[PDB]
Paper text:
In Pectobacterium, iron acquisition via plant ferredoxin is mediated by the Ferredoxin uptake system (Fus), a molecular machine consisting of inner and outer membrane transporters and a periplasmically localised protease. Intriguingly, the outer membrane transporter from this system, a TonB-dependent transporter (TBDT) designated FusA, imports intact ferredoxin into the periplasm of the bacteria where it is processed by the M16 family protease FusC. To confirm the common architecture of these systems, we characterised the gene cluster analogous to the Fus from Escherichia coli: the ydd/pqqL operon. Furthermore, through structural and biochemical characterisation of the distantly related Fus homologues, YddB and PqqL from E. coli, we show that these proteins share key features with FusA and FusC, suggesting a conserved function.
We hypothesized that the uncharacterised protein PqqL, encoded in an operon with the yddB gene, is a protease that processes the substrate for this system upon import into the bacterial periplasm. PqqL consists of two clam-shell like halves, each formed from two M16 protease subunits.
Residue numbers in the entry: 27 to 495
The structure:
Amino acid sequence: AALPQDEKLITGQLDNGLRYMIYPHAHPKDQVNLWLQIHTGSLQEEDNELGVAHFVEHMMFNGTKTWPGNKVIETFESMGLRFGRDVNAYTSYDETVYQVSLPTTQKQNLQQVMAIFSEWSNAATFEKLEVDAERGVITEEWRAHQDAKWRTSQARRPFLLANTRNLDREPIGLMDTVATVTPAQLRQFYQRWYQPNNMTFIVVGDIDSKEALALIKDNLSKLPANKAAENRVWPTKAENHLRFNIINDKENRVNGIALYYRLPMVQVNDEQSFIEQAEWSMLVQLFNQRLQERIQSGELKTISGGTARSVKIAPDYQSLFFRVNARDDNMQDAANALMAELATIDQHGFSAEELDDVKSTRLTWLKNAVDQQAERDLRMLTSRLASSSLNNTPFLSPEETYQLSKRLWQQITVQSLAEKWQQLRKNQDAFWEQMVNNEVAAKKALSPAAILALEKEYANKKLAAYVFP
Ligand SMILES: [Cl-]
Ligand SMILES: [Cl-]
């Protein structure tokens, strides 16, 4: 049974195939976000196109038919719109998005911005001199972003992205492709993927339905009805092997231990998939709740903190990890705390009071989210709608989210979660990870045999059931 989209959301398609999504919002008043979403990122690049989706994105600000060279930037600047502030763009594995935020009070400026979007759609020129200028830009940005977080992501990457197309398609690409790719090759990718049926224009902000629909139709319906190439899908394959990693980086600020599981990610488009996602989310929250209760009650002063989280790793896949942050260089205490909590849940699961508290506090938040919906952050709301568009999943209103949760969560029990926990714990696609920032913590890090001997020790213990306070 298909989920309804927010009552206030306006969706549709122009005759040329371009899709649009309009959502009214008046916080801040007289502000609108205009985003052009290309449903193609780095995943679709051929072996000789590594970083071309990202290079194409940069080329939108360096020449169009009406605005050659720096004229697109000079036009935005004449309307008080600055690159990196009001005007932005990004390329990910899944998409390329072009973003403009401006007031709604100057109608000629709204029209001017729409005229620029029309030319980014099919009239970018890729001038030789401009392409050559951007090679240096991309090369410098590639080096600049190589910080501790990037080095940690690079080290985790083979473990986290095993058997994904994402592993071979990091958006920055190769500097050797950036240096040699011809303007004709950049033009080829652009004309292959930048066609109306692979585009969604998103309007979020303080504009009425009639005016927003007219902005789109008056400026984007004349784009020729060309069909883009089909976006290919690479199904992620399980890696039924337990792996181990130690990330040693002196610039990282937190030492700790984590267990990562990799599993399919269901798209929330019906009642059954809404329940499946809610069960993984609740297992994650219940873990977090128990750890925080043990820390605040004073039971765990041997550790600093920790979390459980789910992360998207590919269009069809996710990782669920359980992390405990170490107190200084005390790697043994971190491992002990994590293993002890995972084994306690293995043996007794969660209580009816623990689940009842997670549900009631989430419903309280959801109810208040309905009451305060007019005050939602514009940027966050635009991002959620862009995400629904990318995943072809219904964009639920705060009211639908609240009503669905109140009704569908009654199918979530201590028994249904115990089943899901046992399934997750038998998942062979897993890896242990430790993070160290000095040679004392590095010497203290557990080797793989020690990790598993600690797991066996806890598995064979008759551990006591946790009692919700
Ligand atoms: Cl990247
Ligand atoms: Cl194994």
